[PDB]
């Protein structure tokens, strides 16, 4: 909905869901990232704030992007679609490349990757003491935002596990294997384990726990397919 608003409206701390997301691994120190949609546009640098507040929760929002450098005027390295998935306490970025340059003026490649995961990291020492929570959300990749993500965390056991379902290619409807909850370098609570496909190991996944009462998880999964590595975006929440 409010795509063009997100590009123009300044930060307002009374919007819904996660209200801003700092672009760290979406824009490096050298580049500028131009995003456009609905005839509006905005250029972000490294560490600038993107206003995710102006957007719908639990949906993927699509911008066209250009990743430039000013060596003269612009030099656009990459183009394609820039996707944000917003939840209440966390959010992800993603890049669906469509064009990359050559030494020849622009080639045509398709690559999909995760960019930034951010939000209110649940501190490891303020997790719920006991109980078990069930999270539900989406699993989305290149040309697919219809995946279903289920996950369960037993806090006193310090264990999480779940599954990705209903994606268009079968090789990614995967189990997210039992993994423990560990503290971060910033003492945030993180889970990182193995991806399993019909009882066999096929890469890794990572999940941060978000929100004051651990309402959400968010992170990524790398899955091996008959055609190589494929990145999945993961965001779920509680009942």
């Amino acid at each position, epitope marked *: 909905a409010g795509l063009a608003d997100a590009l123009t409206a300044p930060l307002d701390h009374k919007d819904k869901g996660l209200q801003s997301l700092t672009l760290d691994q979406s824009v490096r120190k050298n580049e500028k990232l131009k995003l456009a949609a609905q005839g509006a546009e905005k250029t972000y640098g490294n560490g600038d704030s993107l206003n995710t507040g102006k957007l719908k929760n639990d949906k993927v929002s699509r911008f066209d992007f250009i990743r430039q450098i000013e060596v003269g005027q612009l030099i656009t390295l990459e183009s394609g679609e820039f996707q944000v998935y917003k939840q209440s306490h966390s959010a992800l970025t993603a890049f669906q490349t469509e064009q990359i340059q050559d030494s020849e003026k622009m080639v045509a490649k398709r690559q999909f990757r995760i960019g930034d995961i951010a939000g209110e990291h649940t501190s490891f020492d303020k997790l719920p*003491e006991g109980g078990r929570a069930t999270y539900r959300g989406t699993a989305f990749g290149s040309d697919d935002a219809g995946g279903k993500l289920t996950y369960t965390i037993d806090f006193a056991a310090k*264990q999480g596990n779940g599954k990705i379902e209903h994606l268009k290619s079968p090789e990614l409807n995967v189990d997210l294997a039992a*993994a423990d909850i560990k503290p971060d370098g910033k003492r945030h609570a993180v889970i990182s384990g193995s991806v399993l496909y019909n*009882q066999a190991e096929k890469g890794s996944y990572s999940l941060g726990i978000f929100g004051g009462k651990a309402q959400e998880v968010a992170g990524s999964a790398e899955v091996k397919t008959v055609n190589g590595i494929r990145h999945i975006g993961l965001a779920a929440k509680q009942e």
Partner: antibody
Amino acid sequence: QVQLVQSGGGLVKPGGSLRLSCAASGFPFSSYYMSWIRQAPGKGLEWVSDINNSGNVKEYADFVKGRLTISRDNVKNSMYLHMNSLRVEDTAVYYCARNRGRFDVWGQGTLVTVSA
Amino acid sequence: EIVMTQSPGTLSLSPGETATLSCRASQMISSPFLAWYQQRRGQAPRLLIYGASTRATDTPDRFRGSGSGTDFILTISRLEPEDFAVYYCQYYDDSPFTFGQGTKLEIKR
């Protein structure tokens, strides 16, 4: 450097009392559930007790019946089992361990013998 | 209300052989809450596997947990001398976190 170091224990006569202690090192003690498991001489493991992070919620196996109570000290980073009314059936090696159920770190164990 | 029965009670094999240990639950159970522990002579138990198939952080590749419903297997391939020990399974889904009676793995010569 993640460590659980135990102390206490010994021999007591039936109906006597003991204390086990369990000193934690190398991990954020307050974040975790903590448990005691026992092994009778020549047998298998049996969960005894566990306690939540805050130190007030306490589960006991059906053989305990208020004779053993669990407590924790989140600034000295320690855990205790208070043992009263001991029976010869309580003879065993008692281990402290981290987490509820999924015991991913264990102390070295201490010997409690109950005999007349 | 739940009993875990391990078989066989004892077992002999040479180093380099492959061990196959059974953990049978009296009712169907959730595999994310199945654990295997290793207890060597005179030492504390050690978490080896949790979630029926995840290796604890220092369990080497040659241990593999598996199974579902009521059966779980620990397959120890290419037995090294440090692997001869007692092995216990456990269902930690809730109290009393029942352990099995164990299986003793000894050296065949």
